[PDB]
């Protein structure tokens, strides 16, 4: 019939990870990060690295019979930043251009109800 | 110690907190030399 999967996208200020699994989440189809396609640490979070990694992952998934995906995009969350980096939308767009159908899109950043304390002291980074 | 909020102003002097620490260091030494 139709084999649908899930694309988990992890976006921070330092890197991007694109991880395609099956509908239940328990079996991995492909997994590509920014440091696997570019050679400079400075370029790992850039949008272009996101496009390259997304294209590699989409090809590997298409060869194995996946037809479309649902998307789950997240920032680090927790006691770290709640805002996704610059490579989220670029990764989302490059999946559709590569041949997959796109289902529903949502963000699953984990948000505390007044949880743990953040690193940096009571004055924070002083640069 | 007694409060002199005029001492906390920074024009023409060093920080009052560290003057206080220096005074307290100097007072420990006199106390220890007394008991001997």
């Amino acid at each position: 019939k139709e084999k649908w999967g899930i694309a988990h996208i992890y976006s921070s200020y330092n890197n991007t990870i694109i991880h395609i699994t099956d509908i239940t989440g328990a079996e991995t189809i492909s997994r590509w990060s920014g440091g696997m396609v570019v050679k400079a640490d400075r370029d790992e979070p850039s949008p272009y690295a996101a496009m390259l990694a997304a294209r590699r992952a989409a090809e590997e998934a298409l060869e194995k019979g996946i037809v479309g995906v649902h998307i789950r995009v997240r920032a680090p969350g927790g006691s770290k930043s709640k805002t996704p980096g610059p490579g989220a939308q670029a990764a989302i767009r490059a999946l559709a251009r590569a041949g997959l159908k796109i289902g529903r899109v949502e963000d699953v950043t984990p948000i505390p109800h007044d949880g743990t304390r953040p690193k940096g002291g009571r004055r924070g980074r002083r640069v | 110690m007694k409060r002199r909020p005029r001492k906390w102003k920074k024009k023409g002097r060093m920080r009052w907190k560290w003057i206080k620490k220096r005074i307290r260091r100097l007072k420990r030494q006199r106390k220890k030399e007394r008991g001997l």
Partner: protein, 188 residues
């Protein structure tokens, strides 16, 4: 070698539980049939029954039995989408939450989270009165029905309509919902 290990997998069909129709919801790959147990799949209510209104309701089904190429599921929990609840909460309104532990007629342990939104800011005593009304209605319904009927009424919106009708006596309302359900234990 890696491409060799992929070819050993077979694809299993996942079915909805009996009282949701028992329709197909997807396929999962696995090499050994025992590894399919306890896997969880999330689907919306709109897929089960076509209606573009109930697309923010998410249901969780868990695998328990495999026979041939088919896997069968049990109801596990329900939740409303984050973007939907995040849009109801505004300034100059009041949000009332109540979290209750219940037992159905046939000894099922559930935890239920219900939410109510009022048209304006209200005093805390009125919040307590509304929460008490919610507790009474939910306890009576749980004592009255069986597990399947309770779940169906919780996702169809009937309990929320009853709660709103009863709680209009304290203050006019804007919304009333069952926010979340999780199953805690099962009969022996």
């Amino acid at each position: 070698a890696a491409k060799d290990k992929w070819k050993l997998k077979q694809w299993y069909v996942i079915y909805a539980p009996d009282f949701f129709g028992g329709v197909e919801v997807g396929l999962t790959p696995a090499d050994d049939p025992e590894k399919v147990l306890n896997r969880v799949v999330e689907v919306t209510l709109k897929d089960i029954t076509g209606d573009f209104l109930k697309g923010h309701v998410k249901l969780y089904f868990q695998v328990y039995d495999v026979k041939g190429q088919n896997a069968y599921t049990k109801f596990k929990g329900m939740k409303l989408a984050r973007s939907y609840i995040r849009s109801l909460v505004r300034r100059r309104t009041t949000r009332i939450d109540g979290i209750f532990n219940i037992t159905t007629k046939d000894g099922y342990k559930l935890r239920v989270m219900a939410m109510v939104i009022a048209a304006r800011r209200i005093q805390t005593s009125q919040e307590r009165a509304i929460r008490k009304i919610m507790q009474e209605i939910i306890y009576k319904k749980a004592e009255e029905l069986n597990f399947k009927d309770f779940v169906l009424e919780a996702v169809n919106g009937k309990i929320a309509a009853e709660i709103a009708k009863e709680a209009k006596k304290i203050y006019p309302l804007k919304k009333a919902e069952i926010r979340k359900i999780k199953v805690l234990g099962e009969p022996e």
